[PDB]
Swiss-Prot record:
Organism lineage: Bacteria, Bacillati, Actinomycetota, Actinomycetes, Mycobacteriales
Residue ranges that the Swiss-Prot or TrEMBL entry lists as coiled coil: none
Keywords, comma-separated and alphabetical: Cholesterol metabolism, Heme, Iron, Lipid degradation, Lipid metabolism, Metal-binding, Monooxygenase, NAD, Oxidoreductase, Steroid metabolism, Sterol metabolism, Virulence
Highest taxon of source: Bacteria
Entry binding sites for heme: 360
Protein name (record): Steroid C26-monooxygenase
Residues annotated as binding substrate: 185
Main EC class the enzyme belongs to: oxidoreductase
Pfam entry (one): p450
């Protein structure tokens, strides 16, 4: 029995996500075809010209793929499942220079070096400054009475986390945030004029200059840790640091931002959860917010050899697309997945990916950011109420909210 889906439906179709999350369609696959070939017509494969991909909709299959990185490659085709249909293959293969799109052993060496910048000590050291900034952001927004929750609440704190992690001076954070914002969303008409190619080049150039400068004058931020050789002589080259910063500018910006926006959207839809949050302030809320928001709808892998996955024969060279948005509502794993429950514990969501070599290195920085900003929202605008429906982002792999008008005072 084939799944009940519109003909030619592509789960990476940006025109879908500009309007809605295809929640019913994902649930139909989970019930009727949990691993399903998503065919793609000629020239409509978002930069990939192989006829289609395997849609992966169950959490256990997402985890099995993520664990078997020896078979399911990030390097072969990158992990972004959709670009502009016209993108040149060389523009996809340039993504291989960031650690996200690397396989072992190159990924193994890089991740070990990058780990110096994401130790619990390195992240926890940002706590106090990010808490202060979260409080000031929410106070400034509440003083405005009403406005765009996305721009006035969700946007700044994730960017300040990247800036503080890297130790970017305050006078430079303006153009750093601009470059980071010009990296994503260019298939939405609102961002048709952004140039991620130019921005990534500017980010790399800025980052190399910063690596050269930071080598001359070490400090305590992670940049010194990254470019300092260890006992084995391992360190980031200047351009390697540049590719790290470009990855960070994307990895930590719109992901946490959209978790914040869609976390508040869930709170507006479930006022009992919001009342419970304001009273208890449970930090388990962050993980339920990420599960609910699933800012990365999907990442892909490519099979390096034949592999049988849950009774389905994946053939060498074929792409599998891990739909975290489907897996995070898998009825087999979650008790009442469609109930927003900020006390859910344990919460084995795959919003940060499936356990494995590429698991989000900034997951705890993200959770801290989310907890600090929602404590600040609760402190300064506890009676927030939405004014109109959110405006969704036209993207085939990012689940984004561009704008969301709310009344911070409630009256
Ligand atoms: C709610 C916020 C976030 C979400 C939902 C998220 C999601 C993800 C996902 C799905 C992956 C791929 C995992 C895999 O393929 O197995 C990933 C990797 C990564 N994330 Fe995040 N992320 C978030 C925040 C952040 C932040 C704040 C940072 C850093 C400041 C960060 C840095 C990274 C990096 C560097 C990688 C690549 C790791 C590797 O390939 O080894 N992320 N993230
Ligand atoms: C890496 C140094 C700058 C650069 O050069 C370059 C950046 C860049 C970015 C994209 C892109 C990013 C996100 N979304 C869509 C596109 C595409 C191409 C990019 N490039 C050129 C790389 C080519 C590699 C082979 N030689 C000629 C240059
Ligand atoms: C050298 C050019 C790098 C680049 O360009 C790029 C980096 C990057 C990082 C992520 C990411 C990493 C970890 N966690 C979440 C996200 C995702 C995409 C990334 N890219 C390509 C951006 C394209 C822009 C145009 N639309 C398709 C994506
Ligand atoms: Cl994008």
């Amino acid at each position: 029995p084939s799944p009940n889906l519109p003909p030619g439906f592509d789960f990476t179709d940006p025109a879908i996500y500009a309007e809605r999350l295809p929640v019913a369609e994902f649930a139909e696959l989970r019930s009727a075809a949990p691993i399903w070939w998503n065919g793609q017509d000629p020239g409509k494969g978002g930069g990939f010209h192989d006829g289609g991909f395997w849609a992966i909709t169950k959490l256990n299959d997402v985890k099995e793929i993520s664990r078997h990185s020896d078979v399911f490659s990030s390097y072969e085709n990158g992990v972004i499942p959709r670009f502009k249909n016209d993108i040149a293959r060389e523009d996809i293969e340039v993504q291989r220079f960031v650690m996200l799109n690397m396989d072992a052993p190159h990924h193994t060496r890089l991740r070990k070096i990058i780990s110096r910048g994401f130790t619990p000590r390195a992240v926890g050291r940002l706590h106090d400054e990010l808490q202060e900034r979260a409080q000031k952001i929410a106070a400034e927004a509440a003083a405005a009475g009403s406005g765009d929750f996305v721009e006035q609440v969700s946007c700044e704190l994730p960017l300040q986390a990247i800036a503080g992690l890297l130790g970017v001076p305050q006078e430079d954070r303006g153009k750093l945030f601009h470059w980071s914002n010009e990296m994503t969303g260019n298939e939405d008409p609102e961002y048709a004029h952004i140039d991620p190619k130019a921005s990534s080049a500017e980010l790399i150039g800025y980052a190399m200059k910063m690596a050269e400068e930071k080598a001359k004058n070490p400090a305590d931020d992670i940049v010194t840790q990254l470019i300092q050789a260890d006992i084995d002589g391992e360190k980031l080259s200047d351009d390697e640091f540049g590719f790290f910063v470009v990855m960070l500018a994307v990895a930590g910006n719109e992901t946490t931002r959209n978790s914040i926006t869609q976390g508040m959207m869930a709170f507006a839809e479930h006022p009992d959860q919001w009342e419970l949050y304001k009273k208890v302030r449970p930090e388990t809320a962050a993980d339920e917010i990420v599960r609910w928001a699933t800012p990365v709808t999907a990442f892909q892998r490519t099979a390096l050899r034949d592999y049988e996955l849950s009774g389905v024969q994946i053939k060498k060279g074929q792409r599998v697309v891990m739909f975290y948005r489907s897996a995070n509502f898998d009825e087999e794993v979650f008790q009442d997945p469609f109930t927003f429950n900020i006390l859910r514990n344990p919460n084995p969501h795959v919003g940060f990916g499936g356990t494995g070599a590429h698991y989000c290195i900034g997951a705890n920085l993200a959770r801290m950011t989310i907890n600090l900003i929602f404590n600040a929202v609760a402190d300064h605008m506890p009676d927030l109420k939405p004014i109109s429906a959110p405006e969704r982002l036209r993207s085939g792999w990012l689940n984004g909210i561009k704008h969301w008008q709310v009344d911070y005072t409630g009256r």
